[PDB]
């Protein structure tokens, strides 16, 4: 029976879809707009807008399993349609922020908990995949790295443990295709905790040139982030980074435990995405 991959044009969703197609599995790729390009080959395109959960009734026909992105505003509608269609297993792309002690006050933590909890209460089989910082967050430095050798960082000494999107897709695929993952919640990290400055330098090494952070003052960083995210989220980002300033973050072996392969390094990630950081 079919697997519905929501967000099949997304960074993670497209890799989940592609990997399932490589395995011979019938995949429906969920998109908000059927007219647009970017869907991997061999995927049946279906409208599946998680904010308009009446699209889901058609998208879930003949579907046994679902990969789900976190969209809190339509979760009760999703649960209802998944139950009605006979879905047996939902794998959710959540966040490690749900595991920290302030999760239910943190905007990011709350956003993901608002989808985890109704799934937990629904009776559907589930697996939660809970990454720490996405390696792809480094793509926000591309404009500065393309144009010069200095990047401006709010907290150059702040640690995260960035995880490669391919590893996330591999864990999702394991959860969709093998037994033993029911009610599992996998906290995913990369294999090394790294500061912002270290990440920037590793991008430099992949390019063959020395790229450095300079610190920007918090006034300036707050302003930049207030143009990209709501007020509450900027406060959490900066507070999160200040709390990890000079404090190495936890490295978990969860990727290796699930997939049998060590987590991909940020260096490898930078080599994989090197074209994003070269000038036009
Ligand atoms: N950034 C971090 O450090 C971090 C850490 C932990 C967890 N996370 C989680 O990872 C996510 C990022 O995943 P990603 O890298 O794959 O992002 P992405 O490349 O931006 O893809 C996001 C996908 O979500 C889909 N989507 C959004 N709203 C939808 C809706 N209403 N209905 C259907 N599909 C919808 C989009 O579909 P369309 O392309 O069709 O529009 C898009 O394909 C975050 O949202 C968060 O939940 C992030």
Residue numbers in the entry: 1 to 280
Manuscript excerpt for this entry:
SimC7 is a polyketide ketoreductase involved in biosynthesis of the angucyclinone moiety of the gyrase inhibitor simocyclinone D8 (SD8). SimC7, which belongs to the short-chain dehydrogenase/reductase (SDR) superfamily, catalyzes reduction of the C-7 carbonyl of the angucyclinone, and the resulting hydroxyl is essential for antibiotic activity. SimC7 is made up of two domains, the larger of which is the nucleotide binding domain that adopts a Rossmann fold; the smaller substrate binding domain, characteristic of the so-called extended SDR subfamily (Kavanagh et al., 2008), is mainly α-helical and is largely formed by two insertions in the nucleotide binding domain (between β6 and α6, and between β9 and α10). Our results reveal that SimC7 is structurally distinct from previously characterized polyketide ketoreductases and, importantly, lacks the canonical SDR Ser-Tyr-Lys catalytic triad (Kavanagh et al., 2008, Kallberg et al., 2010, Persson and Kallberg, 2013).
To investigate this possibility, we determined the structures of SimC7 alone (apo; 1.6 Å resolution), the binary complex with NADP+ (1.95 Å), and the ternary complex with both NADP+ and 7-oxo-SD8 (1.2 Å). Overall the apo, binary, and ternary SimC7 structures are very similar, with the notable exception of the lid motif, which displays a number of different conformations. Finally, mutation of His112 (H112A, H112N, and H112Q) strongly reduced or abolished enzyme activity, consistent with its key role in binding and positioning the cofactor via a hydrogen bond to the 2′-hydroxyl of the nicotinamide ribosyl moiety. Therefore, SimC7 must be able to orient 7-oxo-SD8 for catalysis without the necessity for the hydrogen bond from Ser95, and this likely arises because the active-site cavity of the binary complex closely matches the shape of the substrate.
